[PDB]
Design a protein around this ligand. Structure first.
Ligand code: 33O
Ligand code: CL
Ligand code: CL
Ligand code: CL
Ligand code: CL
Ligand code: CL
Ligand code: NA
Lengths: 221, 218
């Protein structure tokens, strides 16, 4: 089974450079063209360029002339994308795509899983976990929404559960957003008014990078 | 560059519906060799793009026969004969005829459901955060449909934008709704100089803004 395996998530400060890898197994990159594609958070696909690993021929999109450098190492069956003079605009997922044979045989087209680049000068920082309890009381047989705000951490991921995974219905956990080099995430849970505060509701936050675990009970104000 | 123009931006469908997605190239994409290198891709959440169609109308190996493509030299159409649940995601056209190769801006294929009002909940800063010198006000806007929504914050009646951080979820697999979180972050110092904090949402389901508010001093 063919496989294009991309390197792991990268975190690099602005003004530096990063080199991402795309390693083939089950086929030879000399026999195909490699393409790279960028995708910023909540945006569409953007083409970067192609490289012929056999000949060393390269075509770049004009925008990435200067920014990107595509290379390949046929002996390790690996293609590389270097991104230089980094800024927050380079924060994105980068995909490699091996393709060829469109003329001479059955078209071959395989994609890597993507590599995330986060441009930030932040050091590993544990989260602050804040309980969100309602400002006013609930009416009879109504729904009450509780929340958990997870602020000031780096890098991703943090995890959030409710009652150690026993409260799963009525939960919404929102993707983290980076601003000023640190992440914020939030999670809500909506439960019948008869169940809170009569029963305990706790948000559970883990941050593997900092070895942090925080369990915060949601208590009425 | 050859610019690829997709339409529509969003395509709400029921399962079993026919779906048509179009792409117009700004210039001809018939290569001098005679081939028209027009491709269609589907990208599902958290996944790499998957090739569906190449050279306008050639179905890629493994692609279901419900997918078909046609086109002239500048106008192209992807058709799904009867949409299946696995087809939901974002579709892109792509041309490889002229460097730089270029993608269309994408079309979101989503499930049409009945209109659903946002469930809006506002939260003052926690005592724990205030102890740390911060003051975030959080507003959840949950389980709404359609996805088009606009959130505005007011402090003592005046619009506030500095310090607002929004996040949201894609269409829910069980109920086909969307949700959103909006967090206004202030210093504790600034929080304590104002009284009323308001989250306002505009959505199809209400003719006026949907409002939740509190006053700091209770
Ligand atoms: O009437 C029905 C409808 O009602 C719905 C609402 O129900 C509300 C009540 O909830 C019911 C469901 O929940 C039942 C269980 O309730 C548990 C409440 O527990 C509160 C106390 O929890 C304190 C924290 O407990 C966990 C502490 O763990 C510490 C060790 O952490 C281990 C690591 O964390 C896991 C991830 O790590 C893996 C990587 O290392
Ligand atoms: Cl933060
Ligand atoms: Cl837990
Ligand atoms: Cl049907
Ligand atoms: Cl593009
Ligand atoms: Cl529903
Ligand atoms: Na709702």
């Amino acid at each position: 089974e063919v496989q294009l395996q991309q390197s792991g998530a990268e975190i690099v400060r602005s003004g530096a450079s990063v080199k991402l890898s795309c390693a083939a197994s089950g086929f030879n990159i000399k026999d195909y063209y490699m393409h790279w594609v960028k995708q910023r958070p909540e945006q569409g696909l953007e083409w970067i360029g192609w490289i012929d690993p056999e000949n060393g021929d390269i075509a770049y999109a004009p925008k990435f002339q200067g920014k990107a450098t595509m290379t390949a190492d046929t002996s390790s069956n690996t293609a590389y994308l270097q991104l230089s003079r980094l800024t927050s605009e380079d924060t994105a997922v980068y995909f490699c795509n091996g393709r060829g044979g469109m003329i001479t045989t059955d078209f071959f087209d395989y994609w890597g899983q993507g590599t995330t680049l986060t441009v930030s000068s932040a050091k590993t920082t544990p989260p602050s976990v804040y309980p969100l309890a309602p400002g006013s009381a609930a009416q009879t047989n109504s729904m009450v929404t509780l929340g958990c705000l997870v602020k000031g951490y780096f890098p991703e991921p943090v995890t959030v559960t409710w009652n150690s995974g026993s409260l799963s219905s009525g939960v919404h956990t929102f993707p983290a957003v980076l601003q000023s080099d640190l992440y914020t995430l939030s999670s809500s849970v909506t439960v019948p008014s008869s169940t809170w505060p009569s029963e305990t509701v706790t948000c559970n936050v883990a941050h593997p990078a900092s070895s942090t675990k925080v369990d915060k009970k949601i208590v009425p104000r | 560059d050859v610019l690829m123009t997709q339409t529509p931006l969003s395509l709400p469908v029921s399962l079993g519906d026919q779906a048509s997605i179009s792409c117009r190239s700004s210039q001809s994409i018939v290569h001098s060799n005679g081939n028209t290198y027009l491709e269609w891709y589907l990208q599902k959440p958290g996944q790499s793009p998957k090739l569906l169609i190449y050279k306008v109308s050639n179905r890629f190996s493994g692609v279901p026969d419900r997918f078909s493509g046609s086109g002239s030299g500048t106008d192209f159409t992807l058709k799904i004969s009867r949409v299946e649940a696995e087809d939901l995601g974002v579709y892109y056209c792509f041309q490889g005829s002229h460097v730089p190769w270029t993608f269309g801006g994408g079309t979101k294929l989503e499930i049409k459901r009945a209109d659903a009002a946002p469930t809006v909940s506002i939260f003052p800063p926690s005592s724990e955060q205030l102890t740390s010198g911060g003051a975030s006000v959080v507003c959840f806007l949950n389980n709404f449909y359609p996805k088009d929504i606009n959130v505005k914050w007011k402090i003592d009646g005046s619009e506030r934008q500095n310090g607002v951080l929004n996040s949201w979820t894609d269409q829910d697999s069980k109920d086909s709704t969307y949700s959103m979180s909006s967090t206004l972050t202030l210093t504790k110092d600034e929080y304590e100089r104002h009284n009323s904090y308001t989250c306002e949402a505009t959505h199809k389901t209400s003719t006026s803004p949907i409002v939740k508010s509190f006053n700091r001093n209770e």
